[PDB]
């Protein structure tokens, strides 16, 4: 009823994943000139969804 938000999927990445490759790193995605040294906002986003 809640939605079962336990399952997650990666939405933001810089490269197309190679076959049979895994990306577990949850580092903050950088989508702009901002250094994105943590504390994401207006240019940095959480990679997972």
């Amino acid at each position: 009823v809640g939605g079962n938000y336990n399952y997650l999927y990666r939405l933001f990445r810089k490269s197309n994943l190679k076959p049979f490759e895994r990306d577990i790193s949850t580092e903050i995605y950088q989508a702009g000139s901002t250094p994105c040294n943590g504390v994401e906002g207006f240019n940095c986003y959480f990679p997972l969804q």
């Binding site: 190679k18 049979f20 490759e21 895994r22």
Partner: protein, 48 residues
């Protein structure tokens, strides 16, 4: 293709200066299924 393949061979050499001049094909050992993008590597020795 996300397959770390390791081959090896052990050869009794006589030289103590450089690699021997000869042919010794390396028979395979392992084809482990890892999915990392290897870019760097390093050796690991023992310090008694």
């Amino acid at each position: 293709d996300g397959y770390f393949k390791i081959y090896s061979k052990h050869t009794p050499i006589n030289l103590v200066r450089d690699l021997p001049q000869g042919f010794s094909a390396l028979e395979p050992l392992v084809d482990l299924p890892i999915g990392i993008n290897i870019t760097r590597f390093q050796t690991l020795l023992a310090l008694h």
